[PDB]
Design a protein around this ligand. Structure first.
Ligand code: FAD
Ligand code: FAD
Lengths: 309, 317
């Protein structure tokens, strides 16, 4: 099994494949990096000349020409936005910028309630549109202020796009990983399905043909005996989320959707997250704070992906 | 150990083969497969007036027309294939399909006049249709009231992909699904080997030979029939229309088989390539660069061509 590692999107990517030799794996390293750089140059909020950031810097309310991938990513992210009751909101940009959770200048003082209200007045899923045509795709906003942030959906795409690259290179047996987003196919070098482990206050899943993603870290919470001020923002309040929910793991058809649902479920909190998961029948595992210890919950749909042996 | 299921949908046949479940659950899967295919039929059919597509076609509103997520993505995929085939496969070719009587419509009393053809193809065009995607809502939009969208060459492909999604949904990772000419597969046989899709090659004397491919994780679709050509000693006036001439295609290209990431794309591409013809198709296939197998007529016999990308899918055992 040839393993490859590198850096993309301010984080790490990992690819493992079975079927090719060391020389062919070194050539795959270059092809992977090239594609991930292109995905970075398409979606990054940290690069002013990226395709998204060019759209964000534009004040135009007219249709804004984009690639097929960009249109499909935003479309996918808008749909998750509606299914999470607006919890996962890609227009949360101005709020992200206000608290200084992106590339921009750190706030001199803690944002006032007025500053918070003014910033979320620039947010809204209603304000963004995708227009698909024969040989042309467009993003459209009805508010010049609108600032789109695809951070919670980018790694997921990168992982899924990396899986397709694996396919067109003729490789059927693989594990692809970008950040916390992961996707898998076929058997590893030892004839077993790829081993994705999830930390329990350890469970092993088989997610071949699916995507997995985790938001939050129990491992960090246990070590640091506490939690960062969250970089995940609740669109309803305009403030960082304040929940006892520590970590959320989602198994979905694509890694992009797994990545998107992660944040949405974190925004909703334990009770509302479980309710939407039951209603829409999703594969979700979550860790929450319980006094001085922890409690775990996994949906019936999540249980089906566990490996017994 | 393989459970095999068959039935009818969309005026053609569907086949599903599944490893990993018993007979009692395969029977239950039959019901779930049929229900979903009936729904897909009720979404995409041109032969059913109360279908979602036909409701859009009978509407002359130029404002955004509310459709399902699937409908929006199907059309999005179809328009893109339209552009990448240089307009060859055109989902707005409806009016012309209806004029020649290739759809559900009443058979023409006389052969279409050059003027009738011009008037019909003035109601066609890829630039006349767009898709609008929003949070919680999707829309189709036309700028021409007479526009008629026909998704015949993309429906079976979608149905095959949607069926493959249901297999994953039911926890089945070892399957072969097909609707009409479109097909998709995953995993191993009951004998523990990749699903074997057979593609007919021309016969030399007495030895009938065919190529075997592994298309696991991909979609495959064949347009045209070599066996029918060989037996009948010729082909019928084609139901595939060239949107440029407004006429049935008269090419020596007998059959086209495409392997693509999805069955919908394979379904959409083989019509586009059939419209383009041998030379033009081969040029696109090399530049694109697609996984294609084609059979063309060569006088009394036939010859075959397959792209380098197609050859990678061949099983060498
Ligand atoms: C294309 C791309 C390029 C990147 N480039 C860089 C880089 O150059 N340098 C760098 O340091 N990091 C970069 N990142 C960030 C990268 O994802 C890192 O892995 C990240 O810093 C670590 O993850 P996280 O803990 O911030 O969680 P994340 O997965 O990044 O989630 C937190 C982020 O989600 C967004 N968010 C907050 N609330 C919501 C909401 N309610 N709905 C939707 N989204 C919300 C915010 O932007 C927040 O920063 C990039 C990300 C992408 C997708
Ligand atoms: C959703 C759905 C429902 C159907 N319901 C019925 C039914 O109820 N009864 C029935 O008899 N048949 C029905 N059909 C068709 C059926 O599936 C058969 O497979 C088909 O009639 C036989 O295949 P064919 O030879 O026409 O090839 P096809 O794959 O059907 O391709 C030919 C068809 O494509 C269309 N076409 C022609 N030129 C172009 C062009 N250049 N660009 C794009 N498209 C073009 C035409 O409509 C033509 O009929 C349905 C098809 C679909 C997708």
């Amino acid at each position: 099994a040839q393993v490859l590692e590198g850096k993309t999107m301010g984080t790490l990517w990992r690819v493992s494949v079975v079927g090719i030799d060391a020389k062919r794996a070194a050539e795959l390293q270059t092809k992977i990096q090239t594609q991930l750089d292109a995905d970075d140059w398409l979606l990054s909020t940290y690069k002013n000349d990226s395709a998204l950031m060019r759209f964000n810097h534009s004040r135009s309310l007219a249709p804004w020409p984009v690639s097929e991938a960009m249109a499909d990513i935003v479309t996918s992210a808008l749909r998750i936005g509606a299914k999470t009751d607006g919890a996962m909101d890609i227009t949360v940009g101005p709020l992200v910028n206000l608290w200084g959770f992106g590339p921009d200048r750190q706030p001199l003082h803690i944002p006032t309630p007025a500053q918070i209200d003014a910033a979320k007045a620039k947010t809204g899923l209603q304000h963004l549109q995708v227009i698909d045509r024969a040989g042309h795709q467009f993003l459209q906003k009805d508010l010049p202020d609108l600032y789109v942030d695809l951070s919670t959906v980018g790694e997921g795409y990168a992982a899924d796009h990396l899986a397709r690259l694996m396919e067109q290179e003729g490789i059927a047996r693989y594990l692809v990983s970008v950040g916390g987003a992961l996707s898998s196919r076929g058997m590893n070098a030892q004839g077993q399905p790829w081993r994705v482990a999830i930390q329990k206050p350890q469970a092993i899943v088989d997610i071949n043909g699916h995507g997995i993603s985790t938001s939050g870290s129990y491992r960090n919470y246990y070590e640091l005996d506490g939690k960062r001020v969250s970089h995940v923002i609740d669109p309803q309040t305009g403030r960082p989320i304040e929940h006892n929910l520590v970590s959320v793991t989602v198994i979905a058809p694509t890694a992009l959707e797994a990545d998107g649902w992660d944040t949405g479920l974190m925004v909703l909190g334990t009770q509302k997250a479980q309710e939407v998961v039951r209603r829409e029948g999703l594969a979700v595992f979550m860790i929450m704070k319980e006094g001085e210890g922890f409690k775990t919950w996994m949906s019936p749909q999540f249980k089906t992906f566990l490996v017994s042996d």
